[PDB]
Structure 1
């Protein structure tokens, strides 16, 4: 028997909250980058890697973590993700001295492991908790919560910590931040103890009801996924999109400031505009897939509009009209961020009934791999040739992704599971 449970909204609310906190810790060093250089006495190279360290950790650690999902269940993953998120925050405030930078690094690495238990989960949490209609929008809300942390992590950190020169007074203001994040993370950890069950009393969908019945080697499931040509094409195309989005967000500050001397306040606002606009895009994408369930057609059109946004952004950025960048970065951030819940849910369609922890996990690895490759490669291109070739470099790889996306078949397998009734 299929019956939706009321707890599903608390589960996503709690998960999106501690994914919000984990995303806060990702960019809390980037927002205060100028000050953290002065406090710890390190180069900007080190502080940038406190955010980049999440990318290198996801790639190797996912396959063990994605293996823990079947063996120990979903609850252990969220508990480990929230507890390490809490532990990684309490290690931070052991480092309020200029000479205690390594404690910050190991504190961030603990949060870095905590992401692997978080970022690939939205597809898995939505499947096990939500019905056939809400399954697409629930994954969007979790991505919506994750993106909210980046938005909160852009405007809150510069408020709590002023740009003061005295270390002793500076350490106090940073300490309040670590208590707030540590306090929030510990409270969210306590919530995960209570409300976050392993699975509802009844299956939420006929797709999940069939998934449990048919559910053997972990390496066998990996082998099946890479035999699927459609999934392999989706992994590459999703990586080229989400990877370019990570390359866009990380490198946008240096591109905008290059054309507009000064204007760092607006440059931070443009970076916030993508995150805020992406919040609308993520939710709209989830609701649209709920009503229409046209995963293949939506993926192609949304991904093309991502290419169009890059084409417009590349050639209008040089124009010098700063108010244009808000719309183009906002429009582009609307579609790339709306692609993330769309990519995760399209992967589940192509790879049902294999676990959503691996399918959306391998999509994330591609995003991390291309996100790293595009970050350094576009960084050298911008330094050596300027930002205009840097954006065209992203445009070319988004063009190849556009062609490959057109070759993905509409092999929606979990839709067929619900149709049988």
Structure 2
């Protein structure tokens, strides 16, 4: 068994166009107050450019999983990169005040490519890396996707200033679309020449066993939904992860409403939320591995997410910009840090069911609640101001905190692991 040096280039290029794809998800929500003026549509319409990523994930998750297991890894990788590249070039045809529907068509194509990209953070690690490197390679793939959102907040406010003149505003928007289109096309060329179908030699003994080994999705889903403990965890995971999508999409609307101007600083808050959360994941992941106390750390971290919202909700309008950075950073520190806790707690409760099925339900719950929260909070912000909009998320996250408390620590995988040893 020998491993090839190509394994690091495979993840590096994958994390690059996953970074580009995540940029296009939030490139409209970071400058939401600017795209409203360019196209003349309301804030609800601009939020759809960030929510169509959520909608397409729900029905396309299962077929893409079947496609990935059928046509291999390279075919899905080419499809995901080409659609991401194709969607970026379609957007450049929408550089007119009246061509908003062209933007939606272009973003929907990028929305389809999101499913083909988020489907294999882990599968790339299995095929290309040995048993020791599976854990770190899977995190690097997720590392790029999260870092794309951080770039997606900081950059658009710098490239696109708040100009009343549509004709001059279109040039600045054109620069942003050209760079993303150029990067996506440049990475699409890279995907063609590096991503191969499989490494020349197996990377680990398990992969050799996996290749030699070579029920249905609906059969598994029935059994997981019989686990009451997992059903509660699915709901609580959706409330937390969905609150992240809702707040990220509406972050520009909340910040600009209380601080006129300062579009560039609103992007910095978005970067602060993501970057702090990226540090939250590694701390929570390391702590959970060492302590192995899945139930207690899930409740403590989930409560801190509620505490983050409470301090964020009331300190946003105090009139101080720096305190928003601290409150949003702490708020984002625990929201993204809860994601590794939810995944590990779900696999622990659903043993020996496949991790892909368990993680798929959590992701679907995240997108379903992301659409509900974004729609409901948007109407509340429009009609009742931004404070009831954030309070609405605080109330729901409080409901999730109680539901998590009733989850029984049925850590059956830990029981199974010690059973094999004895």
User: Above 0.5 in TM-score?
Assistant: yes
Q: In 2 relative to 1, CA 140–283 (structure 1 residues): closer, same or farther, beyond 3 Å?
A: farther
How far 1:244 moved relative to its partner? 1.1
The equivalences for 1:272-291 within 5 A come to 272-289=271-288, 291=290
Q: Deviations over 1:290-348 (max 9, x none)?
A: 55555444333322221222233234445544432221210110111122243334434
Structure 1 residue 267: deviation in Å?
A: 3.4
* Distance in 1 between residues matched to 2:197 and 2:352, nearest whole Å: 19
Supply the distance in 2 between the matched residues of 1:294 and 1:135 (Cα, whole angstroms).
22
In 1, are the aligned partners of 2:380 and 2:386 still within 8 Å (CA)? yes
Q: Is the 8 A contact 1:19 1:146 kept in 2?
A: yes
Maintained 8 Å contact 1:120/1:360:
no
Cα gap change, 1:221 to 1:244, in 2 (>3 Å): same
**Cα distance change of structure 1 residues 314 and 131 upon mapping to structure 2, 3 Å threshold:** farther
Change beyond 3 A, Cα 1:307–1:171: closer
Residues 16 and 338 from structure 1, CA distance in 2 versus in 1: closer, same or farther, beyond 3 angstroms?
A: farther
Q: Quick check: 396-405 or 17-26, which moved more?
A: 396-405
The 8 Å contact of residues 78 and 192 in structure 1, kept in 2 or not, is answered as yes
- Structure 1 spans left out of the alignment, 5+ residues: none
5 Å-filtered alignment, 1:9-408, equals 9-126=8-125, 129=128, 134-164=133-163, 169-198=168-197, 216-260=215-259, 263-289=262-288, 291-292=290-291, 294-317=293-316, 319-352=318-351, 354-408=353-407
The structure-2 alpha-carbon separation of the partners of 1:385 and 1:186, relative to structure 1 and needing over 3 Å to count, comes to closer
Offset of 1:49 from its aligned partner?
1.5
- Paired with 1:316 and 1:84, the residues of 2 have a C-alpha distance of 41
Task: Give a deviation string over 1:120-160, Cα, whole Å, max 9, x none.
Answer: 43344445555666544444333321121122122222333
Deviates further, 37-46 or 84-93: 37-46
Deviation for aligned residue 1:63: 2.4
Q: Give the drift of 1:193.
A: 2.6
CA contact (8 A) 2:281 2:336 kept: yes
- Contact 2:256 2:263 survives alignment (8 Å): yes
1:144-188: CA deviation from partner (whole Å, max 9, x where unpaired): 211211221222223333445555554444333333212211222
Counterpart of 2:131 in 1: which secondary structure?
coil
Query: TM-score, normalising length from structure 2?
Result: 0.84
Q: Are the equivalent residues in 2 in contact too, given 1:207–1:417 (CA < 8 A)?
A: no
- Give the direction of change, closer, same or farther, for the CA distance of 1:253–1:32 in structure 2 (3 Å limit): closer
Task: Kindly state the Cα deviation for residue 232 of structure 1 after the two structures are TM-superposed.
Answer: 2.0
Contact between 2:249 and 2:374, CA under 8 Å: does it hold in 1?
Answer: yes
TM-score, length-scaled by structure 1: 0.84
Shift of 1:358: 3.2
**1:246-301 deviation digits (Å, cap 9, x = unpaired):** 12222333434455555554433323321221222233334445555554443333
Instruction: Provide the C-alpha distance between the structure 2 equivalents of 1:15 and 1:26, rounded to a whole number of angstroms.
Output: 17
Relative to structure 1, is the Cα distance of residues 294 and 198 closer, same or farther in structure 2, using a 3 angstrom cutoff?
Answer: farther
Aligned length: 420
Aligned alpha-carbon RMSD (Å): 3.4
